[PDB]
Amino acid sequence: TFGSGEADCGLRPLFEKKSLEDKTERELLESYID
Amino acid sequence: TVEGSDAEIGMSPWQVMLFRKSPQELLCGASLISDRWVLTAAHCLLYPPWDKNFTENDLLVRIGKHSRTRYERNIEKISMLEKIYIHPRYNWRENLDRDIALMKLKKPVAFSDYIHPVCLPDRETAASLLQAGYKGRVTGWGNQPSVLQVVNLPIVERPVCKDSTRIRITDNMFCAGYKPDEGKRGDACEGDSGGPFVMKSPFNNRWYQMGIVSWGEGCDRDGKYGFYTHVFRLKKWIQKVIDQF
Numbered sequence: 001t002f003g004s005g006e007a008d009c010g011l012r013p014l015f016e017k018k019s020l021e022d023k024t025e026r027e028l029l030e031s032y033i034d
Numbered sequence: 035t036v037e038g039s040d041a042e043i044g045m046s047p048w049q050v051m052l053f054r055k056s057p058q059e060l061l062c063g064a065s066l067i068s069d070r071w072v073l074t075a076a077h078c079l080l081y082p083p084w085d086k087n088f089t090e091n092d093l094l095v096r097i098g099k100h101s102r103t104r105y106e107r108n109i110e111k112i113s114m115l116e117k118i119y120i121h122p123r124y125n126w127r128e129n130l131d132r133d134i135a136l137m138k139l140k141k142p143v144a145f146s147d148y149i150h151p152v153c154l155p156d157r158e159t160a161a162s163l164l165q166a167g168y169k170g171r172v173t174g175w176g177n178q179p180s181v182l183q184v185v186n187l188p189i190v191e192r193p194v195c196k197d198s199t200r201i202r203i204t205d206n207m208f209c210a211g212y213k214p215d216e217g218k219r220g221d222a223c224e225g226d227s228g229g230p231f232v233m234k235s236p237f238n239n240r241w242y243q244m245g246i247v248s249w250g251e252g253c254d255r256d257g258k259y260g261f262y263t264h265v266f267r268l269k270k271w272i273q274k275v276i277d278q279f
Contacts, residue, residue: 002276005068010153010240013146014044022045024171027186028234031169 035174036221036253038183046173048152051096063229066151069142074228076124076135090115098148103180109148114140119275129201133248133263136275152243160266163233166191170233174226185220187211198258206267211259222260223253231262
């Protein structure tokens with residue numbers, strides 16, 4: 001089955017994988033807290 | 035996009051460019067969901083009134099691109115298409131309901147720093163993240179910059195989406211974008227069609243593809259919002275196509 005997809009899906013090599021934050025992602029996470 | 039900002043290198047490594055061969059130009063956005071499966075909008079491939087009926091041999095995909103004006107030596111990858119699957123209930127006659135297609139790559143793409151699949155949401159993730167006021171991110175090309183553009187856009191309440199268009203909005207759709215009084219602060223355009231609307235999970239810090247750009251009523255038109263295919267709602271069909279190959 002495909003299922004939930006790659007074990008690794010949605011974790012970026014140059015960001016999440018290296019604990020680096022992109023320039024605008026904090027705006028997305030802040031919108032969940034409001 | 036309009037009023038977007040330049041993507042960082044490797045910021046959207048699931049981004050796919052769907053090209054025509056003749057002329058050799060960008061047709062639509064798309065997204066990488068595995069080493070051999072790419073998601074796009076059905077209307078990018080199939081729209082009978084406009085004699086739009088692309089087949090596998092009409093198109094190619096480019097993957098790992100930051101710049102639309104340079105071949106990115108040792109970064110970008112190219113693939114031919116083995117097979118196109120349009121959603122059988124794709125409704126081009128009325129409202130682009132189920133505006134989704136899957137494309138099977140002739141050869142699987144190697145993952146790299148620049149090429150990596152996005153996650154598709156489960157029921158839990160869609161329930162948590164796909165709510166009015168929460169922002170997701172659209173990636174595309176300026177409608178003038180040469181590099182991939184990023185816009186972050188809030189999800190719009192369902193009644194407000196319906197009131198903003200004459201199109202019949204279904205539960206397989208959602209809309210996003212700033213309100214008119216907000217002013218110019220970024221927009222997804224008709225030109226960003228096919229590309230992903232992604233959201234970063236605060237639970238597992240993975241990126242999920244919640245939407246596909248279906249149509250845009252702003253930018254070059256006097257309307258308000260962008261309209262997206264609701265990927266979670268079509269996920270059984272996606273899994274069925276991939277499993278049954």
